[PDB]
Amino acid sequence: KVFGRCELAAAMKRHGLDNYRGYSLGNWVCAAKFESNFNTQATNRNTDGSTDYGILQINSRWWCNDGRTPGSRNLCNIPCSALLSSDITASVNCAKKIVSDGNGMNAWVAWRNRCKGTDVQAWIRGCRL
Ligand SMILES: [Cl-]
Ligand SMILES: [Cl-]
Ligand SMILES: [Cl-]
Ligand code: NA
Ligand code: NA
Ligand code: NA
């Protein structure tokens, strides 16, 4: 599913991501924009052989199981395919774990490089929330 911007903001809020670990909703929407262009089915193979899955491009090295990432972990206790669902619950629950791991949203390199420090409120501007 490719979410609209305000549609995704609303879904993220529904699932408790707004201000989670102090990160406002615009941060999460901005991260999703640059990770997946709001497409729940996004996948991307990394040079290390891991793969990133879903709206927030969660990586199989640590967070989910895809059966093809040697030496990896599955700390969200989910198949990586669950992160591709139209329903964002699994991605949100895993993102909560990731952002709590110590480096905040810097875990998402694209957030650090493209969202951090910017007017992230613009990503939720105009939305009925
Ligand atoms: Cl957009
Ligand atoms: Cl915001
Ligand atoms: Cl933080
Ligand atoms: Na992989
Ligand atoms: Na894994
Ligand atoms: Na594996």
Curated annotation (Swiss-Prot):
GO terms for cellular component: cytoplasm; endoplasmic reticulum; extracellular space. Residues 1-129 form the C-type lysozyme domain. It is found in: Secreted. Keywords: Allergen, Antimicrobial, Bacteriolytic enzyme, Disulfide bond, Glycosidase, Hydrolase, Secreted, Signal. The keyword tRNA-binding does not apply. The active site is at 35, 52. It holds the Pfam family Lys. It catalyses: Hydrolysis of (1->4)-beta-linkages between N-acetylmuramic acid and N-acetyl-D-glucosamine residues in a peptidoglycan and between N-acetyl-D-glucosamine residues in chitodextrins. Substrate binds at residue 101. In the egg white and polymorphonuclear leukocytes. Disulfide bonds join 6-127, 30-115, 64-80, 76-94. Gene3D superfamilies: 1.10.530.10. InterPro entries: Glyco_hydro_22, Glyco_hydro_22_CS, Glyco_hydro_22_lys, Lysozyme-like_dom_sf. Its EC number is 3.2.1.17. GO terms for biological process: cell wall macromolecule catabolic process; defense response to bacterium; defense response to Gram-negative bacterium; defense response to Gram-positive bacterium; killing of cells of another organism. Its main location: secreted. It comes from the Eukaryota. GO terms for molecular function: beta-N-acetylglucosaminidase activity; identical protein binding; lysozyme activity. Monomer. Lysozymes have primarily a bacteriolytic function; those in tissues and body fluids are associated with the monocyte-macrophage system and enhance the activity of immunoagents. Has bacteriolytic activity against M.luteus. Belongs to the glycosyl hydrolase 22 family. Lysozyme C is capable of both hydrolysis and transglycosylation; it also shows a slight esterase activity. It acts rapidly on both peptide-substituted and unsubstituted peptidoglycan, and slowly on chitin oligosaccharides. This is Lysozyme C. The gene is LYZ.
